[PDB]
Symmetry: C2
Subunit: 154 residues, 2 copies
């Protein structure tokens, strides 16, 4: 099973591709896309949608695993990030790829064993599961963690 993990955002969009099953997984690709506030919102959304559409077309994943956050602070931030989430969901549906949502405690439990693990603990287990020497970008790492979580729930 080939899975695209997505750490959703507007200024940063983490994408990580893995392939395997519950017992073993192979790293395929990861990246953190960025957009600039000086671009207007429509162009930021167009950039994310275009780059994600290209990656979906190229790698042909069987499933998308997306983070289901309960972040509840600022409505103006939530409106902007919701716009990015909408365009991400749109790209997946246009590709015919089903989306499975996972909360952070599900990720921590699947990758570390417990739901109160630290992020550094999760990234250590991402790198160990995939044989990655270093992961500098936390959004890419989180995206890979989501992809590995879907493989564990399948």
């Amino acid at each position: 099973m080939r899975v695209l993990g997505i750490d959703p955002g507007l200024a940063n969009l983490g994408l990580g591709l893995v392939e395997g099953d519950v017992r073993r997984a192979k790293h395929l690709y990861h990246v953190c896309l960025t957009t600039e506030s000086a671009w207007l919102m429509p162009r930021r959304l167009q950039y994310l949608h275009e780059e994600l559409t290209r990656l979906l077309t190229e790698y042909r994943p069987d499933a998308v695993a997306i983070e289901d956050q309960i972040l509840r602070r600022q409505a103006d931030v939530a409106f902007k990030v919701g716009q990015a989430f909408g365009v991400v969901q749109l790209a997946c549906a246009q590709a015919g790829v089903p989306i499975h949502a996972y909360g952070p405690m599900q990720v921590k439990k699947s990758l570390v064993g417990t739901g109160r693990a630290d992020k550094e603990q999760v990234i250590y287990m991402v790198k160990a599961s995939l044989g990655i020497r270093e992961l500098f970008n936390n959004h890419a790492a989180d995206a890979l963690a989501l992809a590995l979580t879907h493989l564990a729930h399948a």
Copy 2:
């Protein structure tokens, strides 16, 4: 001089196309698209984005006029639909102009302080029957853009 007005929403998306200037406008098209919670969110967004794209491609408007967005997870959900609307406009190369409710009232009604707005929408466009408030709101937005150009 051709404006697509958009009343943004997930369950209801009002669309209204007019052409003209401050003095005279002609009606071209209106609808209220609907989506149901029985569909998963990505499918709802795909349907709205597809139907909006088709209308932008067909009628080739010069501008889009959208209702200005004046709880956090509510904001987040409203944003999902707004994002796909903004994306379709950007892909079409059509500039977006946002207007608030008071701007619509002043542009359309002499009072400037929805029955009065709807009456003025129907009168300006020669529309006898306008039953859907979202489609009416979208037409009111398109007419507001003409008044501000």
